């Protein structure tokens, strides 16, 4: 890909392939030129070393990138490792319809409720708001609905309050030591930027209000919402899976 300002960025596999092709071509030329045995043998050794470096690097000499001391990235280094495809892209992918913020106390809530800022809810539920606006006849085209949402009119707030009625969300804290680190709540729209968390679930989450942060995910499909409401709700997880003792004791 080209970079802004006339600069370019490329992968090491390109230079490895270039090296392999160049050495193969030179060996072919030498063979066609009737060169002495020593030159042909050295060219063969160079070709074999280049192929070995291309396939699995760091086994013989660990060729380093040009103009730098960092070693090249071989084909085998992409698949394996903690940063390879298997562990970095096949199990830990980034996702849409999500966000995070700082958590607060909010002692007035019910055990199945949370506090969600208006801005986060609007930006997470945009497509639902577009659909509702088009359905209700307020906006003729999706562009008009987008403009209305961007202008933040009162009808937009009413439509959001209607579309967030019984749609649960998932809250997650960074170190997920057990399955109680993810639970589903029913959002209650508030003004501000911090998420309000019921006091009784802090022990399960292991959360304290001195700078902690949490993430929110939105289940999209209908079966996803049913699973969130019937399996992950905060009022369904009262006993500890490790032992039948309750986990919602006042702290």
């Amino acid at each position: 890909v080209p970079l802004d300002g006339g600069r370019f960025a490329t992968s090491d596999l390109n230079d490895l392939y270039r090296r392999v092709i160049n050495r193969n071509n030179r060996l072919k030329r030498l063979l066609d030129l009737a060169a002495p045995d020593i030159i042909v043998r050295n060219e063969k050794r160079m070709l074999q070393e280049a192929v070995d470096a291309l396939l699995d690097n760091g086994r013989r000499g660990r060729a380093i990138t040009g103009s730098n001391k960092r070693p090249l990235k071989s084909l085998a280094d992409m698949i394996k490792g903690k940063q390879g495809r298997f562990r970095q892209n096949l199990l830990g992918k980034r996702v849409d319809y999500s966000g995070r913020s700082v958590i607060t106390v909010g002692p007035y809530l019910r055990l199945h409720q949370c506090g969600l800022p208006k801005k986060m809810a609007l930006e997470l539920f945009k497509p639902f708001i577009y659909g509702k606006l088009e359905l209700r006849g307020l906006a003729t085209t999706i562009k008009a609905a987008k403009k209305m949402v961007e202008r933040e009119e009162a009808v937009v707030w009413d439509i959001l309050d209607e579309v967030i009625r019984e749609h649960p969300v998932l809250l997650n804290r960074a170190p997920t030591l057990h399955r109680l680190g993810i639970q589903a709540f029913e959002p209650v729209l508030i003004e501000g930027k911090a998420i309000q968390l019921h006091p009784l679930v802090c022990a399960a989450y292991n959360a304290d209000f001195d700078g902690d942060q949490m993430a929110v995910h939105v289940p999209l499909t209908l079966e996803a919402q049913l699973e969130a409401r019937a399996l992950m709700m905060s009022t369904n997880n009262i006993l500890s899976p490790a032992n039948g003792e309750p986990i919602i004791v006042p702290s």
Binding site: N42, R45, M46, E49, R60, G61
Partner: peptide, 13 residues
């Protein structure tokens, strides 16, 4: 020999 894998050393030898 040291069983070195460097082609440079072999060629020089």
């Amino acid at each position: 020999i040291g069983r070195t894998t460097d082609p440079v050393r072999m060629y020089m030898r």
